[PDB]
Amino acid sequence: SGPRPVVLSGPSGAGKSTLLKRLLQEHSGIFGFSVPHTTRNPRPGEENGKDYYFVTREVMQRDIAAGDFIEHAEFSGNLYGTSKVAVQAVQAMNRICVLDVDLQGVRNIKATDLRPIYISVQPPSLHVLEQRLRQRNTETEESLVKRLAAAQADMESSKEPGLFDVVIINDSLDQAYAELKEALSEEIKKAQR
Amino acid sequence: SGPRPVVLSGPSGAGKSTLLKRLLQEHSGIFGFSVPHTTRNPRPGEENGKDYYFVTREVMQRDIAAGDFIEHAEFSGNLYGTSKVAVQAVQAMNRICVLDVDLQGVRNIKATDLRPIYISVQPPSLHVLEQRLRQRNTETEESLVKRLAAAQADMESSKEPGLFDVVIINDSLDQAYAELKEALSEEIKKAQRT
């Protein structure tokens, strides 16, 4: 039917953002992103199929009960979230659907018939994860400590046997990108033919 | 969501296509057309959400069972059809989704929960439809009589209680166009306001 999607998870500053941009480049037209659904009225400039899939609440709740949605939320009386067929619409275009979701988002993907490659990138340790986070300055010594605690949960959760097919230790960006590229080998070769 | 959809049907050559094209020319950004679905692998140049809603065969059969697709067909081992959700996706974009379908196509929209405006474009009579068609000089005799034979089925099929909210008889193309705009005045004024 097409190339398998990819599920990315891990700490925020552990390098998944830098690895994905390094993956989008050097692989042009290989990767794509799903389009979320919503029951909200379209905003000026938005268009169907590119920004949102605009449906009614009755259809979205019916498809939610059918298990089509990975992420789901309700902000101001309208529903939002990402559907599994939106990921399959990207896979139909011979493009690898990227999915960056929390540990809960990884569980919902396992529920649906989607068969992606679960990949979790992790720091070699929290000491160097603290080190890299302390090199720059975006937190205020309080939001930082919460981030180390938030990362600690996802490091132990990534040890769940059979939850992530490939775990990648970010010893170095060159070694991590090489392991990321080899993990998604046949899926790019399928998308590059 | 917003503007109510429209269903335009009738016999061929009675002015349904000429009226529809004239309406789209006068009112830009107000009307639109649905995007159908398929299980076929995309062709080069095609885009998801513009030419086709590319999904799998599993969901198409499931959504068809849910009474979603107005029409559906199969050829070369793949399914094709137009869904009510695609029609509602056009309505959300403040556009009046035009459903140019046949008699059976009109009945299939009657099942879905869409609330369209069923309009039928008809000639003054089968005799007047003959004179207007024979002047075109674009048909052979066997194809001409087959067109009138199929028209009589759709012309009489237009005579059902509640099948069409409005029926326009194309006596003059100007008066038939004014009747089409009058039957869609509130839906057009709703789209223009929003």
Curated annotation (Swiss-Prot), chain A:
Catalyzes the phosphorylation of GMP to GDP. Essential enzyme for recycling GMP and indirectly, cyclic GMP (cGMP). Involved in the cGMP metabolism in photoreceptors. It may also have a role in the survival and growth progression of some tumors. In addition to its physiological role, GUK1 is essential for converting prodrugs used for the treatment of cancers and viral infections into their pharmacologically active metabolites, most notably acyclovir, ganciclovir, and 6-thioguanine and its closely related analog 6-mercaptopurine. Changing residue 1 to L: Increases in kcat with GMP as substrate. Up-regulated by RD3. One of its GO terms (cellular component) is mitochondrion. Keywords: Acetylation, ATP-binding, Cytoplasm, Disease variant, Kinase, Mitochondrion, Nucleotide-binding, Transferase. The keyword Metal-binding does not apply. It comes from Homo sapiens (Human). Monomer. Interacts with RD3. Changing residue 2 to A: Increases in kcat with GMP as substrate. This is Guanylate kinase.
Curated annotation (Swiss-Prot), chain B:
Its EC number is 2.7.4.8. The active site is at residues 43, 136, 147. Belongs to the guanylate kinase family. It comes from Homo sapiens. This is Guanylate kinase. GO terms for biological process: dATP metabolic process; dGDP biosynthetic process; dGMP metabolic process; GDP biosynthetic process; GDP-mannose metabolic process; glycoprotein transport; nucleobase-containing small molecule interconversion; purine nucleotide metabolic process. The modification N-acetylserine is found at residue 1. Keywords: Acetylation, ATP-binding, Cytoplasm, Disease variant, Kinase, Mitochondrion, Nucleotide-binding, Transferase. ATP binds at residues 13-18, 136, 170-171. Changing residue 95 to H: Increases in kcat with GMP as substrate. The gene is GUK1. It is an enzyme of class 2 (transferase). SUPFAM superfamilies: P-loop containing nucleoside triphosphate hydrolases. Gene3D superfamilies: P-loop containing nucleotide triphosphate hydrolases. Catalyzes the phosphorylation of GMP to GDP. Essential enzyme for recycling GMP and indirectly, cyclic GMP (cGMP). Involved in the cGMP metabolism in photoreceptors. It may also have a role in the survival and growth progression of some tumors. In addition to its physiological role, GUK1 is essential for converting prodrugs used for the treatment of cancers and viral infections into their pharmacologically active metabolites, most notably acyclovir, ganciclovir, and 6-thioguanine and its closely related analog 6-mercaptopurine. It is linked to Mitochondrial DNA depletion syndrome 21: An autosomal recessive mitochondrial disorder characterized by ptosis, ophthalmoparesis, myopathic proximal limb weakness, variable hepatopathy, and altered T-lymphocyte profiles. Multiple mtDNA deletions and depletion are detected in muscle, as well as mitochondrial respiratory chain deficiencies.
